[PDB]
Design a protein around this ligand. Structure first.
Ligand SMILES: NC(=O)c1ccc(F)c(Cl)c1
Ligand SMILES: NC(=O)c1ccc(F)c(Cl)c1
Lengths: 195, 195
């Protein structure tokens, strides 16, 4: 609320980090390497961003990523399509979202309906090479399914601020070359902290 | 031109990585650590971004970063104030830019007038804790002066896509904890490459 913009800004950061592999490129430089071919990336302009959860954080994400020319679609069980249209998000049923997205970001609470919202079934309906962000709640993205989708290339990259257990004991996701991560930093700014 | 957006997008990525230390946090997580205090960050909203160079790239950066609530000021000797106003950038003489900025990004050619545009003299006129981005040309920021500013805290962080020599033989900047780096990836996208 007081921390909505901190959250939204970390999410946008993560999206940019996935498009350009900035954390991986920094690690590579720090290891003494100069690896230009390895870190060929993608432009955000013209890509589709699906936003699951169209509350304050999701809305803030949307208007920022609209400035980059992303097409912003999404889903929210409460917010009407005319209202989301007023902040530039096209609402579609979930089943229509999966195959359209280049990026997916989640901004929901953790409920039975949202636990494993992204799972083996929903990854298989995604466009091959989708990139996923979870800066909301650990478990919205099923971690097992995410790992399997990273291993197959079905998911080209994930950015995780949050984990089912914190700190995470299973390290397979964190250690993956296409996963970027933070120790639950979404609200960790001097401004959010200092009301 | 064809690569203006790729450049702009990397620059904005780097600004977000400086505000939130996403590359350093990823490396930390990958080393099995969970270091939440260490990576307390800042919000972009309400901060001033100084844009030196107000051509296509600089303009694209400005309108992206305006969506985050940054105040965008800048300088370009050849772009009229009226043209820059049309994309929300207030032009000021260089001497007025330095003390205002929380972040400074450069989008100029490498000319005698811009070589060491950020040097010891201009760092000393910056607000303490300025963060700097160079995704333009190696040598616009004097590397020696940047290291000295990082060591004193005058500069709180820097993001470099480009170096005076490539790959850099002096590793003190790349190795600094508050420096994020890439192996000259500003035009490395499938879209820029594939006209
Ligand atoms: N129940 C929910 O809040 C819910 C369930 C499914 C979803 F995709 C979203 Cl965005 C929210
Ligand atoms: N000569 C130039 O092109 C030049 C000199 C100083 C500057 F700050 C800028 Cl943006 C450009």
């Amino acid at each position: 609320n007081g921390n909505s913009l901190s959250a939204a800004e970390l999410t946008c950061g993560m999206i940019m980090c996935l498009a350009r592999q900035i954390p991986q490129a920094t690690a590579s430089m720090k290891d003494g390497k100069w690896e230009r071919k390895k870190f060929m990336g993608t432009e955000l302009n013209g890509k589709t961003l699906g936003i699951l959860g169209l509350g304050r954080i999701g809305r803030e994400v949307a208007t920022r990523m609209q400035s980059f020319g992303m097409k912003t679609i999404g889903y929210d069980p409460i917010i009407s399509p005319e209202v989301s249209a007023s902040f530039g998000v096209q609402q579609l049923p979930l089943e229509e979202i999966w195959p359209l997205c280049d990026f997916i970001t989640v901004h929901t609470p953790l409920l039975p309906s949202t636990t494993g919202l992204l799972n083996d079934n929903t990854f298989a309906q995604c466009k091959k090479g989708v990139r996923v962000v979870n800066c909301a709640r650990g478990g919205i993205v099923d971690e097992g399914a995410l790992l399997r989708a990273l291993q197959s290339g079905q998911c080209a990259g994930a950015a995780l601020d949050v984990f089912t257990e914190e700190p995470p004991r299973d390290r397979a996701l964190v250690d993956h070359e296409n996963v970027i991560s933070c120790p639950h930093l979404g609200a960790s700014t001097k401004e959010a902290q200092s009301r």
